[PDB]
């Protein structure tokens, strides 16, 4: 057991995990904002000739344009890509520093309004060089399969639709209604078919695991964060009550078929409010109830508040 | 058989026995006059020993049979040589094989 | 055709291509392929390694070495050449190796090719070699990258590369450089993998020298944890404190005692922590430089600087049309600002051995070698036999059961396995073997492994056939071991993995065995050898550590009965004969050869085998004794429904039918037909099991009943077949195992209740009689002696005198 | 018959029904409740028909009648407008109380596993009966008239070439009438500029549009079967040696142009074949058929081209590849001179999608290198 009686090796190897666990995990290191900026730096590509605008598209604009054309090569089906997951993770963080911000003293709303243009700005850097359609691209592409890379597109998204800006919405509308395509909706209403709910028959194989001496949040309700991601990219399309779009994604009009998104959610309401009805009558007996079903009722109830907060956005406008 | 035809006078009176190494420069044809082996190109003698018959026997005989310092050119029959069995991309099934050999440097 | 200058380009670049692919290609890959890992010794070499130069030149700090050039002691095996021969003579057979070529007289040349190449670039024409510019510079860029990746290039030549490409930033404290030309995109993407090769070098030249930090920083640790304890355990004065101590620092894992002690870095947790502010301070210093390394802190003064600008002025100056160059030389930048990520993600491949093992080391890459090269080549019989023996050198070298750590960080798990799915996608059974015996022995070795291999259980599944799991090592046997004797994993089991592998037990029983109606058996419905392997599997799921997993056992009797052809023709419907039918069947069709014959399949065998693992199955899925108490209300309706489903009849009278006994005939021995088509008493130990677990023993009339119709007569027989002619008959050695497996351990049990026999006398002294033979046996286990002489002593514990 | 189906048979072009009211003027106007129409088959040209032996069949046209053909569209099995989407309705015959409904599901069928529901006619009928409508792209529509009108066409030019198959002509024609050699070369090339690959010119998403309509578009023809029929064309010409030889049994005006039919067969089957992984893989049977004929001397490049196009798509033809198919290929080199395809040819037969066939490498280098000619 003591440290001193193990071979040089074995420590060794266990200092490099100990050390990789605790110093460079937790060091913080900001690149994404300068990177962006540098890449979004056009150099001399409007003065060495100025015969046609952006003959040389702006770096960004080049790898946005690559991105968008890796969405739309015919395959079979979408396969992981590192490459774009970091890329996505870089711009997303760089969108995202004004709406994060990067009791309280008093700020002024003329305050808010200057960091309103920060985030319009850095919100404008990406989507007036084809984030905007890449992003479509991508879930039209991901043909309904949950990943990593969806996971990716949907931050990135919702990273630019924060604060619901009729400039992206309107780009999104016009790409939509242009290529009059059905695989965007149809990936959509898969993503939302394949959601979680709670689980007590896993609960109580983790219970019974956990309490033998063999804990992990995997056993009950997964992927809260994707279901998360999914109705807040939803609710942002729909942001600021633009009858457009809550009528678009009611009827597809010119498509040769159409989803009800509508409908799909309230499918999955009922799905989760029967969860919770069965948690309910399992824990009813119990006097009182064990962290981890405070825990799972939590999450799910967090859920459970999204998913009202789209619906409301979809009829809040009349 | 092998037939042995001297091109250059050698030392003489020099020809390993059974137990030595030897270097040679060695040019290897088809009957017809295709080449396939040369030492030349890879710069470098091939060294080989007499009695292990790491080399064919048609070969062997025809080193053994010379002396130093003598270029000869050897006839090897397919019966001495691989023959039938050949090499796969290099020599055909059925070809008597010519060799012109220089042996030197006996140790 | 390297050194001809008025040579078309298309045969020039051809030449080139030829000369790669037919001398450097196969090494070079496979140095490629090993190039992933980092696996450094624990040398004094090692220890040498420092993260920035000394100040050679006096007060300099913080001056980054030339990319490329240092001392690399991550192990990597050396290349084989063969000399090109034709006049030996021509003889599974060793893999040949690769031409020979001087390699030493290559490198050179190709250097000074490259170097008059930059020159005449430099000094403009009108008739470039080749045709082009493009002509003249990609095949030497590419052979160039090819040795440099080889490793050929000594440090003198990396230097003098280094200038080549640039000669303002790569000096050592006029000529134009490559990168200020301009070039088409071919040659800038020929330079982008050029500049790959170095930032690679960087990343390992990190990771060893974060190794040979560690080694430095363990002993000191080491040292500090011996004196403190030194200290603490003559600290018998306060012994409050010293128990506290104790219990803060020692007592406790390896792993948590580290983690603690390096959990430091705040300034509170530094008072928390007990090392000293030297050994802290040494922590603290190595990590800033390391920070400083990564670059965490217009001429360009590193290759960081010099790459994003390159990339950038590039994206500037053109609007670049190929997507493989777009690619490479955004997957280049990405490198240089998330420098330390890269650190963090290579981590997990780094790796440190003894300087001890460094030769078992090499030779275990080297095997490894050959398993990931054949993955690109269309399997056949030379490839198989390769792997088999290269599997073999795996299993029997040292490292593979001293570092299973190592092993996984390697994943010759995954590498192994897409061998197998590449196969079955049956030909090369030996082949399918090997990989299923090298899986089942890596599960083995440490439940790390077994967990890692549980991931892919459900895909083994869809892989699994009938054919498949009737080969000898089978993706089911594999999963069955990484499934065994894990509590965790048992639970953790999904639902639709039990409905996949109940399907293939409904579907094997609903038509003949391809195998053996090619071969010309009888056509009997159902492949009862097909079941054998489910129902194996099943009683591996619900069965660990002695005790049922309720929650596995109610799912798979739920489905059981949910579809009931699972339960073969008999057990099924109206039509479902009993047991007694079906055994009674069994035993004519086996007295009749012909029915049993087309004889190796024994398909007379093969019948109520699978009704004895069917059974045993059941009795694994019934519910527990204390929970059957408690009245737990699923668990009695559990214990009902199998109730329902098997009679206690049937299983007392396929108890009690017998089984052929050997005796000695005329030539001194007579037959022992075992295993062919034959009873065997390991079923009536599994009915045994089903009759403890379900249709307790609870009456005394009904125990002495059961004992002596079913038990009495197989002792008798044990005792008669105890003489040393008669022992030495292979089946005696079964009887007895049945018996102290199953027979004797209920007798144990139910010897309180024996108290109180009514004119039970004479049977009681004739099967105490038979017990105490038994005990007095011969060729037999200790164990097996030792539960016979328990048994005695626990049953006369209730007997009156 | 008609029965109920399953998989791509949606995608399929033959579940395809073409509706006629009985009117004339403003028929694909609108249509009425209970309005007698006729229902047509869009690849086969069928009518739907009711016949004493059998509930639902089709029927030639010269057979269709009111009294079979003609069928309404009811609701809730009512014996006293309709919407293309999102309604159900009932089916009547006219001037018959049957109403459309498929057989009791059939345990036998069940057996086979095969879904067909073999639909009889009966007044008694079922709770299914109501249908849903769905419309189809102007593309397939298109599509499967033209199929139809292939198939028919082709039809008639192999049974012209079976009349005289067998006889020789001599001196007078051959009793049938003459083969519609012009109708057979002008939808040659019509489907030959309807099979065409996009331009290379074409922005990536327009082209990568196209490549899927042309997919699609094969994949109908092939699985309606065009490709059996084109084959079967081309053996019923091969079966004559040379344009003399179809002369002396069809005629010279005829044999005029066997030549040019022959290498528009050979150029249509690559146009179907090319590109289309599925397409290429049905012809690991044919590897024979397509390498006995690289010797005829008629559409040499024709065939040479199908082979190309076979053998760089379908990974499962070269684990089929043999000595003697190897042997034939080098005769090409052999016999009709020094060509770069053929080289191309040897090169996708060693290896294909990062995978080397060792025995097809060491055939061709044992086979080729040694001779140093």
């Not at chain 1, 691209?137 to 800006?165: D, F």
């Not at chain 1, 309490?211 to 809260?224: F, H, P, R």
């Not at chain 3, 403009?124 to 160039?144: I, Y």
């Amino acid at each position: 057991t003591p440290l001193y009686n193990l071979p040089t090796h074995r420590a060794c190897n266990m200092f490099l995990e100990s050390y990789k666990a605790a110093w460079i995990l937790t060091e913080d290191h900001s690149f994404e904002d300068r990177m962006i900026d540098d890449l979004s730096k056009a150099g001399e590509q409007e003065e060495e000739e100025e015969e046609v605008e952006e003959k040389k598209p702006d770096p960004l604009h080049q790898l946005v344009l690559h991105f968008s054309r890796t969405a739309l090569t015919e395959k079979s089906k979408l396969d992981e890509d590192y490459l774009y997951m970091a890329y996505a993770d870089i711009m997303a963080k760089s969108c995202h520093l004004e709406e994060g911000g990067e009791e309280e003293v008093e700020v002024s709303f003329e305050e808010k309004e200057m960091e309103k243009q920060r985030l319009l700005y850095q919100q404008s850097r990406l989507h007036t060089r084809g984030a905007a359609e890449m992003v479509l691209q991508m879930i039209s592409a991901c043909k309904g399969e949950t990943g990593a890379m969806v996971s990716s597109t949907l931050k990135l998204g919702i990273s630019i639709l924060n604060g619901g800006n009729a400039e992206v919405q309107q780009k999104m509308l016009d790409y939509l209604k242009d290529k009059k395509e059905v695989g965007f909706f149809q990936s959509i209403q898969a993503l939302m078919q394949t959601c979680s709910v709670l689980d007590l028959n896993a609960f109580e194989r983790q219970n019974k695991a956990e309490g033998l001496g063999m804990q992990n949040g995997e056993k009950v309700m997964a992927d809260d964060e994707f279901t998360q991601d999914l109705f807040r990219f939803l609710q942002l399309l729909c942001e600021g009550h633009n009858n457009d779009f809550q009528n678009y994604l009611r009827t597809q009009t010119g498509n040769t078929t159409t989803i009800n998104i509508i409908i799909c959610t309230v499918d999955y309401l009922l799905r989760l409010q029967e969860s919770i009805s069965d948690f309910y009558w399992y824990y009813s007996g119990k006097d009182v109830i064990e962290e981890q079903g405070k825990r799972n009722f939590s999450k799910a109830m967090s859920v459970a508040k999204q998913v009202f907060n789209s619906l409301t956005e979809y009829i809040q406008g009349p | 058989g092998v037939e042995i035809e001297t091109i250059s006078p050698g030392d003489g009176r020099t020809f390993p026995k059974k137990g030595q190494t030897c270097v040679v420069h060695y040019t290897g044809m088809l009957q017809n006059g295709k080449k396939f082996d040369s030492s030349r190109d890879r710069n470098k003698p091939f060294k080989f020993r007499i009695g292990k018959q790491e080399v064919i026997k048609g070969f062997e005989e025809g080193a053994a049979q010379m002396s130093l310092g003598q270029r000869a050119k050897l006839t090897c029959t397919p019966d001495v040589a691989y023959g039938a069995t050949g090499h796969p991309g290099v020599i055909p099934p059925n070809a008597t094989l010519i060799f012109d050999v220089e042996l030197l440097n006996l140790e | 055709a390297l050194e001809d200058a008025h040579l078309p380009g298309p045969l020039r670049a051809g030449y080139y291509d030829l000369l790669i692919s037919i001398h450097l290609e196969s090494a070079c890959r496979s140095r490629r392929s090993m190039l992933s890992e980092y696996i450094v010794p624990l040398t004094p070499e090692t220890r040498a390694i420092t993260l920035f130069p000394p100040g050679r030149k006096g007060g300099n700090a913080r001056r980054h070495g030339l990319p490329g050039v240092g001392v690399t002691t991550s192990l990597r095996p050396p290349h084989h050449f063969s000399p090109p021969c034709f006049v030996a003579a021509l003889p599974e057979a060793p893999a040949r190796l690769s031409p020979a070529i001087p390699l030493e007289a290559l490198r050179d040349k190709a250097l000074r090719m490259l170097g008059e190449a930059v020159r005449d670039g430099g000094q403009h024409a009108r008739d470039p070699v080749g045709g082009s510019v493009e002509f003249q510079f990609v095949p030497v860029l590419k052979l160039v990258s090819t040795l440099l990746v080889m490793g050929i290039f000594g440090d003198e030549d990396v230097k003098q590369i280094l200038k080549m490409i640039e000669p303002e930033v790569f000096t050592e404290e006029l000529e134009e450089g490559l990168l200020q030309m301009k070039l088409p995109e071919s040659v800038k993407l020929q330079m982008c993998n050029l500049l790959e090769y170095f930032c690679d070098q960087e990343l390992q030249h990190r990771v060893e020298s974060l190794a040979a930090f560690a080694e430095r920083y363990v002993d000191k640790l080491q040292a500090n944890q011996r004196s403190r304890y030194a200290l603490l355990m003559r600290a018998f004065t306060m012994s409050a404190a010293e128990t506290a101590r104790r219990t803060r620092e020692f007592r406790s894992p390896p792993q948590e005692q580290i983690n603690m002690l390096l959990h430091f870095k705040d300034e509170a947790d530094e008072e928390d922590c007990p090392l000293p502010e030297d050994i802290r301070q040494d922590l603290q210093d190595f990590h800033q430089d390391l920070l400083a390394h990564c670059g965490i802190q217009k001429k360009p003064q590193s290759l960081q600087e010099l790459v994003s600008h390159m990339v950038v002025r590039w994206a500037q100056e053109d609007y670049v049309q190929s997507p493989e160059l777009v690619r490479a030389m955004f997957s280049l930048l990405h490198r240089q600002y998330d420098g330390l990520g890269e650190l963090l993600r290579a981590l997990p491949r780094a790796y440190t051995i003894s300087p001890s093992s460094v030769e078992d080391t090499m030779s275990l890459l080297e095997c490894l070698g050959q398993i990931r090269s054949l993955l690109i080549v269309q399997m056949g019989p030379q490839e198989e036999n390769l792997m088999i023996q290269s599997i073999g050198n795996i299993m029997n070298n040292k490292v593979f059961y001293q570092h299973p750590n190592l092993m996984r960080a390697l994943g010759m798990h995954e590498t192994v396995m897409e061998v197998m799915v590449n196969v079955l996608g049956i030909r090369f059974p030996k082949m399918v073997t090997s990989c299923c015996r090298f899986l089942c022995y890596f599960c083995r070795i440490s439940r790390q492994n077994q967990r890692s291999m549980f991931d892919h259980l459900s895909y083994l599944l869809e892989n699994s056939g009938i054919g498949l799991g009737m080969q000898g090592s089978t993706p089911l046997d594999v999963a069955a071991a990484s499934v065994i004797d894990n509590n965790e994993l048992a639970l953790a089991l999904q639902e639709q993995d039990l409905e996949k592998v109940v399907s293939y037990l409904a579907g094997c029983g609903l038509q003949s065995c391809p195998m053996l109606l090619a071969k010309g058996y009888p056509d009997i419905g159902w492949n009862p050898c097909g079941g054998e392997r489910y129902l194996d599997f099943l009683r591996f799921a619900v069965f660990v550590n002695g005790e049922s997993v309720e929650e596995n056992a109610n799912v798979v009797v739920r489905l059981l009965i949910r579809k009931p052809e699972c339960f073969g023709p008999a057990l099924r419907g109206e039509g479902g004969s009993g047991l007694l039918a079906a055994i009674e069947e069994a035993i004519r069709i086996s007295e009749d050869p012909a029915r049993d014959g087309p004889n190796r399949v024994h398909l007379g065998h093969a019948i109520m085998s699978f009704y004895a693992a069917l059974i045993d199955l059941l009795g694994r899925c019934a519910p527990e004794m204390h929970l059957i108490q408690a009245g737990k209300g699923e668990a009695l309706r559990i214990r009902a429904i199998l109730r329902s489903l098997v009679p206690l009849d049937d299983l007392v009278g396929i108890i009690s039918l017998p089984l052929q006994i050997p005796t000695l005939g005329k030539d001194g021995a007579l037959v022992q037909p075992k295993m062919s088509a034959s009873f065997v008493p390991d079923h009536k130990a599994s009915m045994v099991l089903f009759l403890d677990r379900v249709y307790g023993i609870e009456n005394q009339d009904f125990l002495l009943h059961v004992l002596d119709v079913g038990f009495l007569p197989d002792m008798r027989a044990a005792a008669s077949l105890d003489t040393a002619t008669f022992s030495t008959t292979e089946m005696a050695l079964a009887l007895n195992r049945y018996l102290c497996l199953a027979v004797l351990p209920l007798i144990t049990k139910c010897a309180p209740l024996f108290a109180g026999t009514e004119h039970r006398a004479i049977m009681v002294d004739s099967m105490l009689h038979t017990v105490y033979r038994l005990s007095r046996g011969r060729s037999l286990t200790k164990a097996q002696r030792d539960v016979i002489e328990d048994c005695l002593m626990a049953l006369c514990r209730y007997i009156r005198p | 018959l008609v029965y109920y189906e399953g998989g791509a048979v949606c995608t399929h072009a033959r579940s395809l029904w073409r509706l006629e009211p009985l009117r004339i003027s403003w028929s694909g106007s609108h249509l009425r409740w209970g309005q007698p129409l006729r229902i047509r088959h869009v690849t086969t040209g069928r009518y739907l028909a009711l016949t004493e032996d059998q509930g639902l069949v089709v029927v030639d046209a010269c057979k269709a009648h009111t009294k079979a053909t003609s069928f309404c569209f009811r609701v809730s099995k009512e014996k006293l407008e309709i919407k293309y989407g999102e309604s159900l309705c009932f089916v009547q015959h006219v001037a018959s109380g049957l109403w459309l409904t498929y057989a009791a599901p059939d345990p036998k069928a069940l057996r086979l596993g095969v879904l067909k529901k073999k639909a009889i006619l009966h007044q008694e009928g079922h709770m299914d009966d109501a249908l849903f409508l769905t419309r189809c792209q102007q593309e397939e529509s298109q599509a499967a008239r033209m199929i139809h009108s292939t198939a028919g066409l082709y039809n008639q030019f192999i049974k012209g070439l079976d009349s005289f198959s067998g006889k020789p002509r001599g001196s007078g024609p051959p009793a049938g009438p003459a083969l519609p050699i012009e109708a057979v070369i002008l939808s040659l090339q019509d489907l030959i500029g309807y099979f065409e690959p996009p331009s290379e010119e074409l922005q990536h998403e327009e082209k990568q549009s196209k490549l899927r309509s042309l997919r699609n578009r094969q994949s109908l023809f092939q699985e309606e079967g065009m490709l059996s029929l084109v084959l079967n064309c081309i053996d019923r010409l091969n079966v004559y040696t040379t344009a003399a030889h179809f002369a002396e049994y069809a005629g010279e005006e005829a044999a005029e142009s066997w030549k040019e039919i022959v290498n528009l067969l050979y150029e249509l089957l690559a146009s179907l074949i090319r590109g289309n992984r599925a397409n290429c893989a049905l012809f690991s049977t044919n590897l024979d058929w397509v390498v006995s004929k690289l010797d005829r001397l008629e559409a040499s490049s024709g065939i040479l081209e199908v082979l190309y196009c076979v053998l760089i798509e379908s990974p499962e033809v070269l684990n089929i590849i043999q000595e003697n198919h190897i042997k034939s290929i080098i005769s090409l080199l052999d016999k009709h001179g020094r060509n770069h395809k053929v080289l191309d040819v040897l090169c996708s037969l060693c290896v294909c999608n990062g995978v080397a066939v060792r025995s097809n490498q060491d055939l061709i280098t044992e086979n080729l290198l040694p001779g140093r000619e």
